[PDB]
Amino acid sequence: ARRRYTRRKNRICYLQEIFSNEMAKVDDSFFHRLEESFLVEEDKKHERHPIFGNIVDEVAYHEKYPTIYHLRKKLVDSTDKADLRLIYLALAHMIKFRGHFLIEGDLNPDNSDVDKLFIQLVQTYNQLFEENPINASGVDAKAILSARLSKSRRLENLIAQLPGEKKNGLFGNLIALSLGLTPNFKSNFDLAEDAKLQLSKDTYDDDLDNLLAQIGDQYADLFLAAKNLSDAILLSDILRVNTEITKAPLSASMIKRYDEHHQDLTLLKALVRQQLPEKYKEIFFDQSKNGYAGYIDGGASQEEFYKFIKPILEKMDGTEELLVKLNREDLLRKQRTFDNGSIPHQIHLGELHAILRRQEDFYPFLKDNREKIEKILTFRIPYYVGPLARGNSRFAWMTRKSEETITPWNFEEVVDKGASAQSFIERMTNFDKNLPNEKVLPKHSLLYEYFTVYNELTKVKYVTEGMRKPAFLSGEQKKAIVDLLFKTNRKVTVKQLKEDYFKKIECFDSVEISGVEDRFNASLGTYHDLLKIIKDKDFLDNEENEDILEDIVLTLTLFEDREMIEERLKTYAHLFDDKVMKQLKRRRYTGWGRLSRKLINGIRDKQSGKTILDFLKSDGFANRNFMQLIHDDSLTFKEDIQKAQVSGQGDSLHEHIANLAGSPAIKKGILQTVKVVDELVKVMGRHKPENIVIEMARENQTTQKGQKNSRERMKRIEEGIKELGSQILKEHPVENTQLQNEKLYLYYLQNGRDMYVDQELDINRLSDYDVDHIVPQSFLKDDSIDNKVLTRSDKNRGKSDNVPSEEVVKKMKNYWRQLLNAKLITQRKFDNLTKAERGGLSELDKAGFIKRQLVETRQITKHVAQILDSRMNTKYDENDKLIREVKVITLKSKLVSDFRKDFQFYKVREINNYHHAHDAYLNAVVGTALIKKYPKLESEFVYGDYKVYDVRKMIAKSEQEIGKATAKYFFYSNIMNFFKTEITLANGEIRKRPLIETNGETGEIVWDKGRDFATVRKVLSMPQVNIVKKTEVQTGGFSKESPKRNSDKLIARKKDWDPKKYGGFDSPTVAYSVLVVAKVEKGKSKKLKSVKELLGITIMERSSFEKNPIDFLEAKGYKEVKKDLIIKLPKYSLFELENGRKRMLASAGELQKGNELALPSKYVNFLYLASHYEKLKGSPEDNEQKQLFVEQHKHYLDEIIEQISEFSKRVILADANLDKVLSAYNKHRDKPIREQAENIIHLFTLTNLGAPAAFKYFDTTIDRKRYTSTKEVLDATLIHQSITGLYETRIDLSQ
RNA sequence: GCGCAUAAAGAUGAGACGCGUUUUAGAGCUAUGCUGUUUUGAAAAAAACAGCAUAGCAAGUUAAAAUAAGGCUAGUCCGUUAUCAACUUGAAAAAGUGGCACCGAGUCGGUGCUU
């Protein structure tokens, strides 16, 4: 934003410098008046009227030119010598609002009507195809393509106008291309490969040449007709019927807007004064009622204005036209509105050239520098250049050929565009992990494709019908495979390799591949692209040409601009024809591989003398894979990759964390946990612990679900409808290229039937149909298919603030179950569709989490695992392997969760933050006991190191659970049930478990089922748990970004701009509060009394205060200031007063609750079971006993009420609010136990640590109790604090 | 444990476009009434001179300023975000700093050695 404003201002400044000498001849203090335009007449240096200075001429300008567009159109058409100031105003106004540069080239005002160009389009389509010429048949195009709605929705009606032509058809695709959609002509022109075009992209010209040369010189005028059609379709609201009236279509259209505004204004005034004369004072005077005063002088928008006046209009018998204009959205529209984001810069450039050409016959200087001004308007900084810095920006990369201030005329000379784009892309590409200082080859390298092909073919094992044992394909065999099939087709399926090679060359009756499934992963696409472009196989097949090939790929990847690619390849223009040079430069590639060139064919092996590519291409008897090649002491590769870099280089205990990859959201958390761990080892005897157990977010899903969610769209759809038996695919077949639209994917997901209405959806109104969320966006933000459903209209869902009403579930349950058996919707989707009848959505299901926090947790766990793996284990053994004094153990979330669930040790997080420390304790105990219990399976849990321990051989059943997923879950249940007291198996029968369950081979008691659970019970019931919030200084924006007032809270917007006479900012964010003690004057006698208080240091003030503190305090209005009594107090500074009542410094004028109600485990588990938190599924018997236990212990309710009352009267000072709570509980004492439990749970947020926020108990809105006075902190107990809350330093604030 | 195909996601950094905000310029008016009023004077009365109030009206679209205060590094550059516990050194970086056998456990209390 800052750079934007500065560069625009400088462009205006450029035009001013160009006009400097002449403006001085016209008006000496013109620019002075323009720079002081903000100032009032009382403080204006020169005249308040900008242009002429006097009053009358300004009034004359406002008369003859109501808008700027009247002067615009006037200067564009007329060739008369106008005043220089007006010319300057027009040009500067054009520069100040240039327009978008989204459309490359130029749109010379052609027909400027959809009708003519559409007729030309139909003419081209009829002359092109005599197979089926399609006419427009008199469809009004300039209303069917200019309607204010979706482009695809416009395509729907457009293709509906002519029956018999499908939307993917050549006519439908062409009118989709005119609308800015993404059509395709692979089925229209019957091209062998896919080839889609789009007008918006800048590669459209090269793609056009590509597709045209692939199909011939025949169909080409149709796309330029569509181009000018789009040029005429952009100005829908700004349509000026004829292009010959002026050369400024936009300006005359704006004049039309002004006119319609005036007409509808006088109209509305007359009509109101006629029918409702009492309402005129509200529409046209009240600015805070969305009337015309609120629309114009007020802050109301066009939508709010229309919504406000629509019932006022329709409640009058007249107006007629105003209702139509409201629906057509062109009622009293202004000129500077919201819809101008579509305006391209080309029309402003056109009007500029017209004004210049019409005024260059008088003044010589603008006739001399008209191309300079055109360069000013046309200038656009390339994205690959970046900041135009002179070495003073950490974001720049641009290299200066010279050292001048870069201007739009010498831009091409000062800026090395080549080196700037080069440095732009190289700074983003990664390096090889094996070879750190070396870069990486592009993604289209022929050597790299040969690498992945040979690597994927080193395990394609061949089994002959007569062969006795499987043997991998030999070196010559691989080359045979490549040359016969992998070099002929784009991608070869395993079935194709089996049928088209083995039977033709080896003539084997049957093949048996044990290396690749379904189809081959690797391919040789670049080879086929080159052979189709350069049409010379010999160059790509030649081994000597590989350096030229790698450089060509490098050029086509590093650059995109046709001129740049053409310049980089002028040295290679002798090997291919100029037309071939055009086709190659037209083609451009994106992406980069993962490995270097020196790794593939640079690094040779000592024993062999061949490279990695050769070993993958041929290794003889044992065609070893990449991992076997690298991890082989017999070769030299392992030795030479180890010379990489140095991990133990200069990285402090900080820095290294801020040197990590990813988002900064993770770095904070990481720094916190690592410093916590360091303190933990530092406290307990300054020696390393036995074990360290951590929790990882990686859990083991089943094979069926993991393949069902990752089932590619055509796979899941085809299998789904085939299992269902419906013929929706035979009626409308589409591939995944045009399937990326939301509602179409949803349409094919629901088998052409609405999930609510149980009716057939139609391909016409696709964007008109509503996509509805199962759970509303008020609760959670979800865009995934698990929450969305395509419906005809969103009013059939039921309620707008909850999961679909019972009318739809009890009417669509059969359809949802039939969609569940067809494998179309997932189990979670059906559960959400069926959650309505399960209880709907309670207020407990707030669900504030966002998926990014999930992948963020995965990120922080993956990073910490490899940070901790190297920070705790430092020494190495005698065989060069790290000594693991501390083991980092990774416990899955499922085990600890089930451990809390299967032993009545439930957790309700919202009471306090003790459940985290409880989880930590449970992870530690479960981890150490588990690893002591079974050391043969202990290798799977520790971070880093691992034993082979193949799960296939563990449970090699007839079932074949293997393939890990199913096997890992069955193995997980098998090892997890051994810790329990009674073992019930899903495998077959039972066995009672020993209360100790120690392992005979270890001979050590691993767990006591009678006393360790009691220590868990105690820990879960322990009152003292160290919960500490990080006292951090607030940083950031100076204040809230949102008139003049007589208050001191206003902040001067500029230096000399007084907020009392100009208006200013408000609500400054206090960075950190400062405790001061001095003397100020008091009373009429102005006595210096000793005072102490909290001073608010805002973010803007922080630098100025931290520089000279004493001078700042003396400037504030203090006398005799204690220099040694200036305490810097961040937010959340802990303070304690009476009966363990703690308060945290929320601000310089607000505090926070600092105490937690230490409640025993019994009430917690009771609340869990009573409020019905997880539907407590198991065997019905124990569920019914627990239900009985809920009905019996109904006194726990009143006991909780007592607990809250004492804690609130002791700390919270909840008084009147607490009374309202008690009254609500007495009023609702008759309500069922579950609801009262849920609402008791609701009440805990009042006792939560930190800021006080509002909540509800039933219907009783319980607001927040803010602490508006910070006087009591001044004589409290300062608690200067430490990271585990163990080292408490207390300060009695009495000094 | 990588080379890989499909379908997604994130993150980064540039380049630009729509407003908006608040000021000023939109030279808005009419009548009536009020006082001070050079006022014709010795006063009265305004031309209400000055404002005030009452009503009634009328237009109303846009132009300009800046857009974190600002900074200097004067660049067409920087400045809203990571990055801050207490504490002693050390310019900073960085380092160090608070025990433990045992009994209880209300925001913890003791205890052997013993800080």
Curated annotation (Swiss-Prot):
Cofactor(s) the record lists: Mg(2+)
GO MF: 3'-5' exonuclease activity; DNA binding; DNA endonuclease activity; metal ion binding; RNA binding
Positions of the HNH Cas9-type domain: 703-854
Effect of residue 773 to A: Target DNA complementary to the crRNA is not cleaved; nickase activity. In vivo, loss of Cas9-mediated CRISPR interference in plasmid transformation. Able to process and bind guide RNAs and target DNA but not cleave DNA
EC assignment: 3.1.-.-
Signal peptide interval: none
Industrial and biotechnological uses noted in the record: Coexpression of Cas9 with an artificial single guide RNA (sgRNA) which fuses the crRNA with the tracrRNA in human cells has shown it is possible to target and modify DNA sequences of interest. Cas9 plus the 2 sgRNAs have also been expressed individually in human and mouse cells to achieve DNA targeting; cleavage efficiencies of the artificial sgRNA were lower that those for systems with the 2 sgRNAs expressed separately. Microinjection of Cas9-encoding mRNA and a synthetic sgRNA into zebrafish embryos induces targeted mutations.
Binding site for Mn(2+) 3: 1228, 1259
Pfam family, one: Cas9-BH
Span list, region PAM-interacting domain (PI): 1032-1295
InterPro entries for the chain: Cas9, Cas9-BH, Cas9_PI, Cas9_REC, Cas9_RuvC, HNH_CAS9, HNH_nuc, RNaseH_sf
Stated role: CRISPR (clustered regularly interspaced short palindromic repeat) is an adaptive immune system that provides protection against mobile genetic elements (viruses, transposable elements and conjugative plasmids). CRISPR clusters contain spacers, sequences complementary to antecedent mobile elements, and target invading nucleic acids. CRISPR clusters are transcribed and processed into CRISPR RNA (crRNA). In type II CRISPR systems correct processing of pre-crRNA requires a trans-encoded small RNA (tracrRNA), endogenous ribonuclease 3 (rnc) and this protein.
HAMAP family assigned: Cas9
Name used for this protein in its record: CRISPR-associated endonuclease Cas9/Csn1
